[PDB]
Subunit: 197 residues, 10 copies
């Protein structure tokens, strides 16, 4: 529970202008029905931790796409500012060409609905949200401004939520593909407990 | 923004009876002034994902303490249920002896203040909070019920927040001890961008 | 009148997950229409007075069932904690095999509806409620925490309310099956008064 | 919790004119500081269950007084009505000479404060309250109108509350003077459980 | 103007259990349509002025009944107390056999509706109400507790209101049957005024 | 219970211009401290029952003054209308000379405070109030318009209240100077009941 | 604008008992539809300026009626007081026979609706109101108590309003029948202005 | 009865820019302490009845000034419009040179305070107010728009109020200087009534 | 940003009496559907900056009319004052014959709806509003009192809004008919940017 | 009237991070005491009309500075975006080097305080505000998005307000330095009007 965002309930609906392959396009949550979505907010264009997180997610976008998961970034900056930043070379602090949409949240509606607006600055905190194929919010990750998130951890979480959805077993702490899972009932769970201890 | 918990503001205060070293004792946020705290809520004692997270954090508890970070677990279960679970062998689904405090939130006040109560069941979601030594909340991680968290990522985040506290530099996506950081100003950050791209 | 539970009015309905014969089952008050119900709340699993009350009601459960009365115990603990307690031998402070349903009130709504939640601890007081076959509350018994109730007195009261429901007479102080009763009108009551004085 | 009457809190204060040894006197709860009090409400003078409870408590009044416990009966009838009833022989449905005070709640303030007023009739339910020497409410017992209470059970409860106050042990289900008690801590209660099972 | 009672408006409707001819019976204002009603409230059974007023009205009940007027007495005492008082000899302060219904007002509804409750004692003041055959209130007489009313004045008033109802002349101060009346219009009233001065 | 007028509490204070011995004078309730007051309201000057009451009280003013009781009459009419009616011979339907003050309630404040206004006509009902020497209301008498009050009954009631104030005995129904009274306690009242029955 | 009386809006409806040629008659505003009404309030019957205004208006009533205007006087005094004053010779300060209805505003509804009550005394100020044949208020004249109005000015105003109603020209300051008027439009008004200056 | 203006209460205080002798000046009500004031509102400059009233008052200004009474005109028009109108010849509908201040009420505060705004047009009705030397409102005259006031009647009213102020006698209907007045008391007014009837 | 007036929303509707070609006519915003409107407020008739702005717009009225734009002036003065001002020669501070409507806002409703009232004076600030043919507000210009607006700038703005309405182009700073414009999209904007720098 | 912005009142205070001579600096309104300020909001960096207004004001900044007027631009974009745009060549749609401060309003506080936010897009309309040396708001110009403002007109207005401040004369419509002004009083304004007509 962050703003209108609640784990286990339909993620707050959104619609925004975004920069997609160097052009402007409308992006909305209902477009991703049947797909997982990683939605990540960041405070500001033309800053420091920011480009490193956007570039990391862009570099791994294909890994998420192989899981039927779309990655979307969003800040309060306009789509014109985003495009300027994509048109700035990475060596100069820019983003260069990107493989993920960058959404504009100029009214702050998306940030307010997801509960990540840092009100004394008017910018979003590093809030990352994982939404399943039914549009349900499954995970919330929010960091204060000085520390970047982990793309590997986001990937692990998407893999774990898909695993539990598809198999009806739960994922222990630190689960990664290949790791044992637990059948969530008193008697069937003893198979895990007896083997891991 | 989780219940009364807000990034960048004093973490909601808490006071509870906990099981510490096999005995009951009161634990409160003011006991940890000067140290980082990793407060992780979990839904129910005697369940499935739950013991795996608790044991993983207990097994790594000294790794956090060497950084001046204390790990505390909490559920709505009482201290008598917790002790009973601790006195249940790990191969039977128990916790065994533990190296971390296990707090009882029988009134649900801690769960309500941290905005993690799953209202229709009266149990906390998998909410993990990172609090600095000044008592300020720096990170929020909340997972839906079927998927466990990562102790490696909690440790990465505590390290990163401590690093930025002491150096005034910011940590890029994926940062781990030893990785490059950025100086957060337009001119000085050029050193990172030219090197990394 | 305790919370929403008022003598002479339908008892607050509920539904809960319970442990019944070692497995989980949904129990609803509205399921016992036609039978008397002794609903007894107790504060916490794995404590002291508590097992003695649960075991004493379990041991006498068939005496109540022979009268068409079902006994239900409830605490705020989960059904997993109840099962673990039932799985603990009586010699170790456990319940051992149980002959009555043990309900979980994890949301505290049953305790709040019956007005027995000790608010500052989040646990129920020792409140016992006698509900007739019409679902109507007939008796309220609430003890502070250090003192157990009496199963013999609960049985006496169920017998007395059944007797008065069935005959046109009222039950004097200390009535038990076979004791004299009184016909409640000025002239017919003299039969009783003539013999006791 | 009944009206303003809540377990573990100061019982609602009261003041009323009473019939005491055939004369009128004011009785107030503060008159009994340092003593236990059994306060029992009943619906109506010159009725049927009513005299059987009042006489049973008057006949056993010394059994309570030997323990430092005073018994007080109360109904909405005036002290003039109570006195006419005391002046009516027991064989005629009267009370005869009485060994306990009979309080008149003509304003209905005591019934309302103790939450036992049966609103559609303006008479009190059969509510009995055990109050300790510090003025704290310890037990609530309320019967619907056709069934009398038990003087033996009230006496057992007073004894038990007094025993736990004095020794700091707790009273199992069905405890009676002479019965074993439990020390309420996880270490010292183990011997109780092992030796009784 | 007393509670809901207003001169010239329909008397407040009432319904109550009463002692009539030694037995219990329901009495309600609508039973008396077409008849005058003298409704007299009194504070308490088994007291001092009270029996003198009840007996005086009872003794003269047929005098009112010859005028088509019914007299009803009412207090907050129950019907069981009223019957006990009727069954007590007058020499001992009792009422003896009664020739008027004695209504019970245990909920205090009638006293509240007629505005005569002495709220600091919960008992009715000495309020007497004269209601005509149309069900309209014609007269209010309320005495403080230490002074009894006059049955002779109640009768004079009933006669006077019935006289003015039938003839349309008005009754001067002190009128009694046989006395001069006034034709209420400027010219016709001189008959009276010239004669008397 | 009349407007702000309540038996047993200080009568509503009042100040009014009155006609006193053919001249205008200010009269206030407070002026009568230490004496009884009979305050009688009447609907309208130049009407029919009205002069008969005013004349009846004026003719007998000394009967009340010898008792330390003042009589005051009041209507909503002005002092000029009162004076015109005093200056009209009695044989013509006038008041002639008077021995009591006749108050003007042109604002209707007195009539409102005593709760006797007939709202749809703006005139007072025939309300008479007996106020003692301490300023406390003791008796309320209100007649509908067509029937006059009784000076004899007002005098009987003044005598009675004075006797009960002085002797601390209570007056039975119909009491008149010389009648037996009752000592208001259970034992001493037997003297009256055995004497009169 | 006075109370509910607003110039240019429907005059507040009224209905009252009046004295008309020595008898009592109901008078209501709807009886004057199609006619002008001069409604004049005055403070009190049997006073000083008052008789002079009522007499001045009655003496000239036919001058108004010849124009289709009715004159009505009103005070808070009753119809009996009004008839007493009409029955008092003009030479003794009375009204003598009258040629205009005198309305009784005993409930004060008329004076309150017209906003003329001197609230500290309960009497109307000298407010005079001119209502046209459509029931619309056209003129408000209010004098403090010591100064009487002018019948000549009231007549002038009725004549001027009737003139403007019929001709759609406006009446200059001081206009009297026969005086020049102005066509209220810029061009046509020049005929008045050039000829008068 | 007008906005904040009420007879017998201090006239609403005011201040405004006025045109005085063809120049602008501040005028405030406190300037006239000790003097009578005739304050007349009018709807609009450059209209039809309006100039005729202003000119009538201006032409007679010295008749009022000789009595210690100042005449003030006011509309919602500005002082610039007032001066333009003053600078327009009377033959063309102007005012010509003026001998009384003309107050500008551009904020409409004066008109709202005196209750004369015709709210749907934003202009004042023809309201004239007579204020004495103590600043008390004594007279209210309000005409609908089509009919002008009377300067002669305004002068008669000022003379009458001043006469009554100085002599303590009251002015009959139609009084003019030289006319008889009445001493307002029952005995001293008889001479006036006998002489005039 | 002005009262009810918001850029991008329907301009506040209005209806007013105006002077049009020396005569009075009602003017309303709905008469101008399909045409631009320049609505300009000014503080007071017969003042200083004001005629210069009114005359400037009047002289240039056909420059706006040829674009399908109507110019409307408005002040709080009445239409009578407007016309008097139009009838005063320009040489004396007048407006002379005008070629644009001059609206009267005597109720102040237009000035309040457009948020231009200077409340402590009751006059409008120098607010000019440009409304398109759809009735939408496009431009707000408001000056403090000492400084006149610019007719040339109002015309340039009207031209620019009409230009951008009809072409897929926006107007740079300082644009006039014939000047360069920019196509508002990233790629197409380059024609302007490379041509101008 | 715009948000908190009101002509004649203190301009809404502001404080912001700006870009000044290619670096970040704190800018606040109080820094400009004694100087005129032209504050101009614009919707979005990296857009179309936007650069043309910022460049025009920048190119003419010394024209303003020579009058002691400072020009400041503001948008909701961050100072990092502003720097980036300044660092973009003009031929590619950038700002190039700038001679005026560019303020960031990322919380939207300035835009909301000046009432210029287009709420559905979260960007400021083209609002320009002229604040004098005393901090008072003198002028408001707001354009819808597609049309730029005029630096020539902005300069005319600053010049006009400074002149009126300094000479106490007023500036006619269309005034430019060298044009005739008006002494704002009825008599001295005549020289201006006689000369032009």
């Amino acid at each position: 529970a962050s703003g209108n965002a609640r784990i286990g309930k339909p993620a707050p609906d959104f619609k925004a202008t975004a920069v997609v392959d160097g052009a402007f396009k409308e992006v909305k949550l209902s477009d991703y029905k049947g797909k997982y979505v990683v939605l990540f907010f960041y405070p500001l264009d033309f800053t420091f931790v920011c480009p490193t997180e956007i570039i990391a997610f862009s570099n791994r976008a294909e890994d998420f796409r192989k899981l039927g998961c779309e990655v979307l970034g969003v800040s309060v900056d306009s789509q014109f500012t985003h495009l300027a930043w994509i048109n700035t070379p990475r060596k100069e602090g820019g983003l260069g060409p990107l493989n993920i949409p960058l959404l504009a949240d100029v009214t702050r509606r998306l940030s307010e609905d997801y509960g990540v607006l840092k009100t004394d600055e008017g910018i979003a905190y590093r809030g990352l949200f994982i939404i399943d194929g039914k549009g349900v919010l499954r995970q919330i990750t929010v960091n204060d401004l000085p520390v970047g998130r982990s793309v590997d951890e986001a990937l692990r979480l998407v893999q774990a939520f898909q695993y539990t959805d598809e198999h009806g077993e739960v994922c222990p702490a630190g689960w990664k593909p290949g790791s044992d899972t637990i059948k969530p009932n008193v008697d069937d769970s003893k198979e895990y407990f007896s083997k891991h201890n």
